[PDB]
């Protein structure tokens, strides 16, 4: 009946606060990540604070490809007006002192599951008039950050691929918008989720956090 | 016997590249899906270069086990240069994407690659005359309409091997970290050549302009901290 946000990695941090600050504005909810007991916690505060938000729950470990398509899958008939990819984690190692099993996660969830859910989300809704993508990258996404090489590279790939999806859809006409969020590698959850809800309203593909100051601007990589 | 290392060797600079370094003489571990296309450059390459060592591996490296078990059947024998080659691109709207080449393509061009690269660095970085080599694209600086997700690949490949090859650098390894970025000369044999010079230089990056213009040996394009 209604219209829905989709949030991925909402249990915690900029997700939570996401969810929490759209509920605010009265909006309805598809809540993404792997725990249930998070998911179930968030959804009770939520409905908290907006009775009459409708939450969707869908407890999904992301790094698994098949997880994801299902994930799409099963929301496709839902009518969503905006889907923010905020699944992932970060590292801080050596490249010589990496954990595989963690970097390779990481490189699922970053940049697998965003790629295939962000291109699911244009497939449908490229046309249609109000729809937001926001994908979550990281000022590391925009300058290499000693001791985390792999994370900062999963996030220029980020910051890079939505630049570029941003731009392919602006300079073709496209209805839907989709924007980049870049936090630094304002320091709190609840701080970075109205920097998110200031991207999501604005006409700026980029809202990147520096002086720690956040901007509203345009693509940082070269385009041809 | 001191083995050169290509994956992706069937096809464009990793096959060219496996020609030139025959001409010098270089024992080989070649790695591509089939073992049909392998053996034919096997023969090239001793055609050139009879007394070359030629391992052959028939992998896919797109998965991400065949990966570790590439690397581990070759762990102990004596690499001096590692070439990440593997890999493709695709010209498409977002919208129209296949995406199980898509997936591959992360698959391949990101992950086989970060595997490898991270693997060879774990066991190679205290190692004298070792150098790491990743094969981008200039669309991994500059992002070419109609492929974008090809080009957020070998942004992530850019971003990860000038962060590496800093790395090394700061902490006085001897492991060198290279990336070579062709368009999106032009031939392959030419930047096969291109690719020895970048080896031999002291330049992180090795790039085609992307206006038009030939090679440049130079350092890292990406923003780093300190």
């Given at each position: 009946?209604?219209?829905?946000?989709?949030?991925?990695?909402?249990?915690?941090?900029?997700?939570?606060?996401?969810?929490?600050?759209?509920?605010?504005?009265?909006?309805?909810?598809?809540?993404?990540?792997?725990?249930?007991?998070?998911?179930?916690?968030?959804?009770?505060?939520?409905?908290?604070?907006?009775?009459?938000?409708?939450?969707?729950?869908?407890?999904?470990?992301?790094?698994?490809?098949?997880?994801?398509?299902?994930?799409?899958?099963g929301l496709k008939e839902l009518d969503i007006e905006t889907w923010i990819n905020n699944a992932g984690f970060g590292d801080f190692d050596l490249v010589q002192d990496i954990e595989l099993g963690k970097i390779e996660k990481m490189?699922?969830?970053?940049?697998?599951?965003?790629?295939?859910?962000?291109?699911?989300?244009?497939?449908?809704?490229?046309?249609?008039?109000?729809?937001?993508?926001?994908?979550?990258?990281?000022?590391?996404?925009?300058?290499?950050?000693?001791?985390?090489?792999?994370?900062?590279?999963?996030?220029?790939?980020?910051s890079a691929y939505t630049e570029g999806l941003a731009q392919e859809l602006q300079k073709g006409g496209a209805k839907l918008r989709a924007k980049v969020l870049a936090p630094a590698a304002y320091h709190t959850a609840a701080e970075m989720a109205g920097f998110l809800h200031q991207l999501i309203e604005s006409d700026a593909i980029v809202g990147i956090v520096d002086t720690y100051e956040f901007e509203l601007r345009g693509p940082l990589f070269n385009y041809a």
């Open positions: 009946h209604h219209k829905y946000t989709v949030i991925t990695g909402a249990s915690s941090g900029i997700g939570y606060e996401t969810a929490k600050l759209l509920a605010g504005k009265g909006k309805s909810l598809v809540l993404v990540a792997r725990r249930t007991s998070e998911l179930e916690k968030l959804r009770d505060e939520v409905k908290q604070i907006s009775p009459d938000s409708d939450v969707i729950l869908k407890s999904v470990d992301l790094a698994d490809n098949q997880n994801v398509h299902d994930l799409y899958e490189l699922r969830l970053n940049i697998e599951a965003l790629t295939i859910l962000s291109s699911l989300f244009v497939r449908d809704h490229h046309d249609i008039e109000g729809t937001t993508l926001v994908n979550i990258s990281s000022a590391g996404g925009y300058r290499i950050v000693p001791n985390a090489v792999t994370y900062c590279a999963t996030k220029f790939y980020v």
